[PDB]
RNA sequence: UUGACAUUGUGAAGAGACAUAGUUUCUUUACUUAUUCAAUGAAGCGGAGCUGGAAUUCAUUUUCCACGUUCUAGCAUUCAAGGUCCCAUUCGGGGCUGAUCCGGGUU
RNA sequence: GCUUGUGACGGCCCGUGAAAAUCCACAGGAAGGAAUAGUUUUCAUGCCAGGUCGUACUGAUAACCGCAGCAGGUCUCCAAG
RNA sequence: GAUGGGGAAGCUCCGUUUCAAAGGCCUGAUUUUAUGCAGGCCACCAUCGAAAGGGAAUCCGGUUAAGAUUCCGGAACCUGG
C-alpha cells in the first residue's frame, strides 16, 4: 500500500503496554502488624497538679502521646480506648521529646469521672 | 605574580551581565515561509526601555499562521517606528522604515538595522543605539549584497539575510558628557562589572606588566605583540600605529 | 443551498490559519530510524567497489518463484518428523535386525555457512541461494568467487529471512542444494541454466563494475537542469 | 486581591455589555466601528478588483 | 604559529615520468556523502503541471516572469463551510473534494 | 501639630527601577437543556473536615560573639509634655 | 543541581532543554467488570534555593507561678468535600 500521514512534525514516543508485576514469590513473607495501635498511640496520663486542673476545670484528659502519633490517632485511639468522645486534640511536643495531648471531651462527658475511672487522682 | 586583571574576567564570575532587568533577547522573526515567500503583517504593541541597552526594544505582535494563538517577538525599534503601526516582514514586502526585507529585494543606498550575517541569523549587524548599515551593491548570480557597517567595513552576504528599514532608535547617546563620576557609575551598575578602572601603572609588579617602579611609568613599549600570550597582553595590543590621529579616517 | 452557506477559505498567507496537512515528509525521526536511512544513503553516494555490488543484482522474482518452489519440497526434518523417524526406526531397526538403514536416504536442502563452504569446496553442491542481506557482509562475498572456481552455479536471493523460513530457522543467510530426487532432476537443470547466465556468465564481467556514485535527486534534478541548457542550448 | 476574586460573585467582575470585565467600553465602541467599516470596505475592494479582471 | 603525515572521497581542465598511448602525482574549480556551522515545538523543499500573462511566432511554441494578504490598534481556533459519494437512515459518522501531481534530502 | 498610612500630581535618569506560583475575566460556542415540566449551586440557607513541625525565655555594660557576668561587637518595629 | 548525552586513567568535569522515541488531563467506551480502548487535546522536560520577597482565611474580652491572634468565652472567615 503506502504510508501513514502524520499531521505533525513531532514524533512522540509510542504509547506501549505497561504490565503490572506478577510476582514468582512474595515481597516480606507475613505482613507487618499495626505499628501504631491504640495502646502504642496513648502511653500514659499526664498527672500533673497544673493538668489535674485541666481535668476537673476544663474537661479535658492530658496524656503522653507517641511522637508518631497525630491528631486523628490521638482522637480515635481515645475514643476506642476510653468510650469517650472527643471534641478536638490539641498536641504539643513537651522539651523532654515527648508529646503532649489535650483531649477536650464533649459536655456529654465528665473528664474527671472518665480520668479517676482509669485511675489516677 | 599574581593574574592579572584582564585574565579574571574570563571565568565569570563577579564580571558576568547584569541580566535581570532585560526585556529578552532582540531577534527577527524566525525566517519561515511567509517571510520568504511573501511577507506578513504584525503591530507595534510597545516600544520600551531596555535596561543597559541604548536603544529602545519595539514589542512586535504577529499571528501565527500555523496555530490560532499570537506570537510575540522584540524587535530594536526603528527610528520613527511607533505605537500601532502595521509592519510588513518578508521578500514581497514594501520598503518602508521599520518592515524587515531582504537585502537583495532593495535598492542601493537603502538603509537598513539589525542586518542579518547569514540569512535566518535573526539579525547581527548595527544594532546599537544610532547604527546603521547601507547597501552598495547586488551581484544577483550567486546572488550576494554588498553592505558597508558602521565600523567603516565592506562585507558581502547573501541576498536573502534580512535586514530592517530605516537607523536604530535612541541616537546622539554618546553626545552628552557623563558628568561625573556616578552617572557612569550608574550605567555599568546594569552592564557588567567593568568600572571604575585602576591603571595598571598604579599597581605592584605581582598585578600588571606594567606594575612597579620607583615613579609610574610603563617601563617598555606598551604595544604588545598578536602573538603574545595570555597575561602578556594588556597594552595596545597588534596596534599597527599610534599617536594622536591627524588628518581625516574615513575609509576609501 | 436552505439556510446553509458556501463561504470558502482564504489559505493564502496573511490570514487563515493554514489547515492540517501530511507533513510525514518532514517528521523528526528517533536517531536510530535517520541512522539506518543515511546508511542506505551514504552506501549509494559512494563509489562501491566491485566485489561487493555484485550483490544489488539479485535473482528476479519469476525464476527466484521457481527456485523457491523447488527448494520447497526439500525442507528439512521437523521436530516431529524427526521424533516420528527415531521411534519408527528404534524400535524397527533395534528388533527386526534392520541394518539402521529401516530409515531411507533424506533429500533435503543443505545450509549454514560452515557447511555450504566446505560443499562447494568439494563439489558437492548443484546449486547454492546467497543472501543479498548479510550485514557483516565478509560472510557472502567471497562465495561468488568461491561458486565460480569451484564451477558451483549459484545465485543471489532477494530475502535472507526467506531462506529461514524454507529452512525452518528465522534467517538462514544461505541454502544449498546437492541431492535431487530423479523427478526434481529435470527442472534443475533448466533452474540452474537461468541462473548461470544470470550471475555465474557474468560474474567475469561484473568483476570490473563498480557500483554506487548515484546522487540524490535534488542533486540529479539539478545537474539535469544544468547538463540539459548550458550545452544544448 | 486575585483569589479574592473567587469570593464574590460574577456581577462584581462584570458589566453587561460584551466584553463586559475586560475592555474599558469607549474601547470596545471602537472596535465595533473599525469592524464593521473594515469589513465593509472590504466588500468595496472585492467588487472593484472583480471590476479591473473584467476590464483590463 | 608554521609544515608534514593521518582523518581524505568524486569529477573535470592544466602541468608532470617508462622516454608523444595512461596506472600516477601536484596547481586551478567543480562535486556531497565524511567532517564543520546556523535554524526550526524538523511546515511548506526539489521536480513537474494547471491557470494567467509579458513575449515574437519563421509552423507552433523556441521561452522568461509570476501563479489569494498594505488607508483603520477590529475579527481570523471546533478534521471547514460548500459540493459530492457512502452507513441503511437517528443522533451520530466516515471518505473524496475544497487544498493539482511526482521524490520522503527538515531547511 | 507629631508619627504613620494614602491619593491626585510634579522633579529625576546613557539608572526608567524582580520572578513565579496562584486567582479572576473576556472572545469563543462545543455541547446539554422546558410544559405535564426541565435547567440552574458564581443568589441565600444548611452538613462534615482541616494533618505535620515551631510556639518557653534572653536579644544584651549578665542569657549571642569577643577564653569571662569583658567600657568592644552584633539586623529592626512602637515613641508622651 | 539530577537526567539521554559529551569529556576525563579516574576520584569526577561539562551541559539543564542541552543533538533524546523524555509525559498526563479530561471524558467517553463497561453494563462478561473492572477499567482496556475511543476521540480531542497540552507538549510544560527534573528538582533544590526566601521563618525580611510573592502568599487563602480571626477578632475582642478573659484566664496562668510560667502559655496565648494557639487555652476559655463570644463573634467571624477561608479552603476542601
Ligand atoms: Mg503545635
Ligand atoms: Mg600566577
Ligand atoms: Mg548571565
Ligand atoms: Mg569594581
Ligand atoms: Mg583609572
Ligand atoms: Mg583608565
Ligand atoms: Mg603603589
Ligand atoms: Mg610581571
Ligand atoms: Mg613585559
Ligand atoms: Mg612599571
Ligand atoms: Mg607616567
Ligand atoms: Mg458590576
Ligand atoms: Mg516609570
Ligand atoms: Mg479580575
Ligand atoms: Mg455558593
Ligand atoms: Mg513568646
Ligand atoms: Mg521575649
Ligand atoms: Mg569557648
Ligand atoms: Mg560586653
Ligand atoms: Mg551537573
Ligand atoms: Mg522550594
Ligand atoms: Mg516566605
Ligand atoms: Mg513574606
Ligand atoms: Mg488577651
Ligand atoms: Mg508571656
Ligand atoms: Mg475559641
Ligand atoms: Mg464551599
Known amino acids: 500500500k503506502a504510508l501513514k500521514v502524520r499531521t505533525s512534525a513531532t514524533f512522540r514516543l509510542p504509547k506501549t503496554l505497561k504490565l503490572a508485576r506478577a510476582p514468582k514469590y512474595a515481597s516480606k513473607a507475613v505482613p507487618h502488624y499495626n505499628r501504631l495501635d491504640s495502646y502504642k498511640v496513648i502511653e500514659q496520663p499526664i498527672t500533673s497538679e497544673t493538668a489535674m486542673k485541666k481535668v476537673e476545670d476544663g474537661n479535658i484528659l492530658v496524656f503522653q502521646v507517641s511522637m508518631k502519633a497525630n491528631k486523628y490517632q490521638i482522637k480515635k485511639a481515645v475514643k476506642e480506648l476510653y468510650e469517650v468522645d472527643v471534641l478536638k486534640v490539641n498536641t504539643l511536643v513537651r522539651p523532654n521529646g515527648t508529646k503532649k495531648a489535650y483531649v477536650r471531651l464533649t459536655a456529654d462527658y465528665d473528664a474527671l469521672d472518665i480520668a479517676n475511672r482509669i485511675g489516677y487522682i | ?252 | 443551498n436552505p439556510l446553509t452557506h458556501s463561504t470558502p477559505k482564504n489559505f493564502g498567507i496573511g490570514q487563515a490559519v493554514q489547515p492540517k496537512r501530511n507533513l510525514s515528509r518532514y517528521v523528526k525521526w528517533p536517531e536510530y530510524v535517520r541512522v539506518q536511512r543515511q546508511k542506505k544513503i551514504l552506501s549509494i553516494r559512494l563509489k562501491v567497489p566491485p566485489t561487493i555490488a555484485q550483490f544489488q543484482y539479485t535473482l528476479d522474482r519469476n525464476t527466484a518463484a521457481e527456485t523457491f518452489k523447488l527448494f520447497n519440497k526439500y525442507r528439512p526434518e521437523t521436530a516431529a518428523e524427526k521424533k516420528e523417524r527415531l521411534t519408527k526406526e528404534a524400535a524397527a531397526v533395534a528388533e527386526g535386525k534392520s541394518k539402521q538403514d529401516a530409515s531411507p536416504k533424506p533429500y533435503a536442502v543443505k545450509y549454514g555457512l560452515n557447511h555450504v563452504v566446505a560443499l562447494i569446496e568439494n563439489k558437492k553442491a548443484k546449486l547454492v541461494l546467497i543472501a543479498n542481506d548479510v550485514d557483516p557482509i565478509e560472510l557472502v562475498v567471497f562465495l561468488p568467487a568461491l561458486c565460480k572456481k569451484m564451477g558451483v552455479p549459484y545465485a543471489i536471493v532477494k530475502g535472507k529471512a526467506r531462506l529461514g523460513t524454507l529452512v525452518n530457522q528465522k534467517t538462514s543467510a544461505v541454502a544449498a542444494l546437492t541431492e535431487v530426487r530423479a523427478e526434481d532432476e529435470a527442472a534443475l537443470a533448466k533452474l540452474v541454466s537461468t541462473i548461470d547466465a544470470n550471475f555465474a556468465d557474468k560474474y567475469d564481467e561484473v568483476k570490473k563494475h563498480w557500483g554506487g556514485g548515484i546522487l540524490g535527486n535534488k542533486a540529479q534534478a539539478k545537474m539535469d537542469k544544468r547538463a540539459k541548457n548550458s550545452d544544448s542550448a | 486581591r486575585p483569589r479574592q476574586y473567587a469570593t464574590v460573585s460574577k456581577t462584581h467582575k462584570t458589566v453587561s455589555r460584551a466584553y463586559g470585565g475586560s475592555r474599558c467600553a469607549n474601547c470596545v465602541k471602537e472596535r465595533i466601528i473599525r469592524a464593521f467599516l473594515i469589513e465593509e470596505q472590504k466588500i468595496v475592494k472585492k467588487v472593484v478588483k472583480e471590476q479591473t479582471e473584467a476590464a483590463k
Open chain 2, 1 to 252: 605574580g599574581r593574574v592579572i586583571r584582564n585574565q579574571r574576567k574570563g571565568a565569570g564570575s563577579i564580571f558576568t551581565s547584569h541580566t535581570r532587568l532585560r526585556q529578552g533577547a532582540a531577534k527577527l522573526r524566525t525566517l519561515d515561509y511567509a517571510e520568504r515567500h511573501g511577507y506578513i503583517r504584525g503591530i507595534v504593541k510597545q516600544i520600551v526601555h531596555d535596561s543597559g541597552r541604548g536603544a529602545p526594544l519595539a514589542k512586535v505582535v504577529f499571528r501565527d499562521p500555523y496555530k490560532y494563538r499570537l506570537r510575540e517577538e522584540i524587535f530594536i525599534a526603528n527610528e520613527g517606528v511607533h505605537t500601532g503601526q502595521f509592519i510588513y516582514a518578508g521578500k514581497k514586502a514594501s520598503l518602508n522604515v521599520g518592515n524587515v526585507l531582504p537585502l537583495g529585494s532593495v535598492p542601493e543606498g537603502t538603509i537598513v538595522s539589525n542586518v542579518e550575517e547569514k540569512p535566518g541569523d535573526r539579525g547581527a549587524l548595527a544594532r546599537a543605539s544610532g547604527n546603521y548599515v547601507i547597501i552598495i551593491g547586488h551581484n544577483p548570480d550567486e546572488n550576494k549584497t554588498r553592505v558597508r557597517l558602521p565600523s567603516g567595513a565592506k562585507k558581502v552576504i547573501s541576498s536573502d539575510a534580512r535586514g530592517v528599514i530605516g537607523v536604530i532608535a535612541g541616537g546622539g547617546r554618546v553626545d552628552k558628557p557623563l558628568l561625573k563620576a556616578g552617572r557612569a557609575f550608574h550605567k555599568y551598575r546594569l552592564k557588567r562589572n567593568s568600572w571604575p578602572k585602576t591603571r595598571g601603572v598604579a599597581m605592584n609588579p605581582v598585578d600588571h606588566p606594567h606594575g612597579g617602579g620607583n615613579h609610574q611609568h610603563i617601563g617598555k613599549a606598551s604595544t604588545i605583540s598578536r602573538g603574545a600570550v595570555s597575561g602578556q597582553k594588556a597594552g595596545l595590543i597588534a596596534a599597527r600605529r599610534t599617536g594622536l590621529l591627524r588628518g581625516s579616517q574615513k575609509t576609501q
